[PDB]
Each structure stands twice: as structure tokens, then as C-alpha cells.
């Protein structure tokens, strides 16, 4: 669990450690301690359910780019764990959810 600190009003950027080999289709899960996880992005290009237009992912165009999730205008309520479920073409079925990161807030 890698920690990462963000101050108020800034723009946060979270990247998962696993790197894809081919066509990727990632899912970004937000899990608050004690509550059920909330799905943010499912097809790496669009948000699954209506949420504030603050979380954005990178599309899968011109293979060679990493997978990053950006959050503009972060508030105090954005304190939860982030899971980067990776799905590629040269690895088969993916069972592990990957190593989660710990977002900390300054102020």
C-alpha cells in the first residue's frame, strides 16, 4: 500500500503499478473504510454512473501510454482506497485486484 498526499484545491493523479501488454480495459474502484466500493470508471474511457465530472481516465489510443486516473478539484471527502483492475489481451483472466494506494489529504 503506497501512500500519496494531496493538498486542497489541487489535481490528483493516481497510477496503478501493473503495466498492460496490448489492448487494455481497466476499472477504477473507490473503497471507503466501512462502506461498499463505488465504481468510478469501467471501460477506461467513460464513467459508469452519474457522478461529478471530476474523475477522468485516459483512452486506449496509440498503444504505449500508461493508465492514470485524474481528479480535479479534490475535496476532503476524497479519502478512500483506489483499486486499478487491469485487463489486457496477453495475460488471460485476471483474478487479483492489484496493490491499492492510500490517498492522504493535506488540511
Amino acid at each position, epitope marked *: 500500500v503506497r501512500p500519496l498526499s494531496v493538498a486542497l484545491g489541487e489535481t490528483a493523479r493516481i497510477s496503478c503499478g501493473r503495466q498492460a501488454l*496490448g*489492448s487494455r*480495459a481497466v*476499472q477504477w474502484y473507490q*473503497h471507503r473504510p466501512g462502506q*461498499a*466500493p*463505488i*465504481l468510478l470508471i*469501467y*471501460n477506461n474511457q467513460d464513467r*459508469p*454512473s452519474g457522478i461529478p465530472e471530476r474523475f477522468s481516465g485516459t483512452p486506449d489510443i496509440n498503444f504505449g501510454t500508461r493508465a492514470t486516473l485524474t481528479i480535479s478539484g479534490v475535496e476532503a471527502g476524497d479519502e478512500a482506497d483506489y*483499486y486499478c483492475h487491469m*485487463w489486457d*489481451s496477453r495475460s488471460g483472466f485476471s*483474478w487479483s*485486484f492489484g*496493490g*491499492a494506494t492510500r490517498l492522504t489529504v493535506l488540511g
Partner: nanobody
Amino acid sequence: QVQLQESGPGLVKPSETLSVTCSVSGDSMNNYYWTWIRQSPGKGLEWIGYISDRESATYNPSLNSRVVISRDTSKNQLSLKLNSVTPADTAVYYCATARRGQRIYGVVSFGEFFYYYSMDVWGKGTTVTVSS
């Protein structure tokens, strides 16, 4: 809209069967997949298995296949039973639904595509403990 509820005993003696039930209200079992996921304190999330209308109980290869999941449409619920429980298996369980999609990257007649699953609706889950 879909509503999901969960139920479990909570206190089970080790080396016995641990059964947890998950019921659905509002919608039927027409086109809704099901899946279970456990989370133990100190470790991350762990996907254990999923089931659908195909009776294909596919389990995690890192689990020794010691759990069975069933779903009866008469009572309109599913339930998972893990046999030979270990006292070190104290974890919170969640019953969720899954949505399947396909990603295509080449010619379809040759089979150049792959399926993926995404959980959209979740539940509160039960916290069960096992001790002597």
C-alpha cells in the same frame, strides 16, 4: 432499481460449514449475474467466485475450491457455503452483481477478442467471526 440484502450466522466453530445467504428484491434473475467477494483485515480485496444462470461454478485457483455457491429461484436468493473453515479466515463478505462485456481488437471470425466483468451494484456485506 435493484435491492439486495444479506444474512449470516456470524459465530461458527472452526472446521465446520460457513453459509451466507444473499437475497434480491425488486428484480428477478433474468439477466443479472452474481458474485461474492471477501475482505480480510490487513489484506486487500479477494475475488472468490461468481455464478450466473449457467450453473458454471468457476472458482479462484488460489482457493483450493472448498466453497460451493447455489442460487434457488423459488425463494429468489443465492447462498455460498465454505467447508472446513479456518480460524484465520475472519473476513467481511459482500454479495454483488456483475455485468459482462467484450473487448474486440481484431477480426471477430478468428476469435480476437476477450471478455471482462464489471461490478456495478454492491452490498453492505456480513462480518463473521470464527473461534474455538
